[PDB]
């Protein structure tokens, strides 16, 4: 297993920050040998972005991942299907993600869609929820790369998101191979939420 | 932009 710990940090209308507490951990699935990683820094920049064209609710999203401080699989455009099934507060939703991954340049294009109608929580909010297999390690740390290393078997990915003053996410996701596309399929769920906080309200600024 | 460590058991 491994370990990361991280605070997002999500504006809100007022002009205040909403601050988002990570616990994360990861754990192979397949019963075999895996890497060690050092402790090491993943560079995340990430924008999000709009389908004029799409009517249903959704998300865009452009990313780049970068390492600082069985990989195969990897060496160019891998698919990825991501599904998430979560209740916020009894709100029963689902997302459903298509895109492609690139490993070698740590690059995401992945858009996602409300499945059910509309999203009960701001889509920032699901970001860091909604495949760091596909960040980009450099040579001298392609070692260090867990992620990659317990593919195609996989791993799962276990994290819980609380957002201070308010509820929290919990959240559990199997990461694995299917056929040559790469899945990402998680459960959410999301207690103790203020009903009219700023995730429940909808009072996050969107973007990120 | 954020920046994450990853630890190990």
């Avoid at chain 1, 004029?52 to 970068?66: A, G, I, S």
């Avoid at chain 1, 290393?149 to 799962?156: A, D, H, I, Q």
Wanted: proline share 5%; net charge negative; aromatic share 10%.
């Amino acid at each position: 297993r491994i370990f990361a710990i991280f605070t997002v940090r999500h504006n809100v209308e007022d002009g205040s920050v909403q601050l988002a507490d990570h616990y994360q951990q990861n754990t192979p699935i397949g019963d075999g040998p895996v890497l060690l990683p050092d402790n090491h820094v993943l560079e995340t920049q990430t924008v999000l972005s709009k389908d004029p064209n799409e009517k249903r609710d959704h998300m865009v999203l452009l990313e780049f991942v970068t390492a600082a401080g069985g990989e195969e699989l990897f060496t160019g455009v891998v698919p990825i299907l991501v599904e998430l099934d979560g209740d916020v507060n009894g709100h029963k939703f689902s997302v459903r993600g298509e895109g492609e991954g690139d490993a070698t340049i740590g690059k995401l294009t992945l858009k996602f869609i409300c499945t059910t109608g509309k999203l009960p929580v701001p889509w920032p909010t699901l970001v860091t929820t909604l495949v760091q297999c596909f960040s980009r390690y450099p040579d001298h740390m392609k070692r260090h790369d867990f992620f990659k290393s317990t593919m195609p078997e996989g791993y799962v990915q276990e994290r819980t998101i609380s957002f201070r003053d308010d509820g929290k996410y919990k959240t559990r996701a199997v990461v694995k191979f299917e056929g040559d596309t790469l899945v990402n399929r998680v459960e959410l769920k999301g207690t103790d939420f203020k009903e009219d906080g700023n995730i429940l309200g909808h009072k996050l600024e969107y973007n990120f | 932009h954020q920046k994450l460590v990853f630890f190990a058991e």
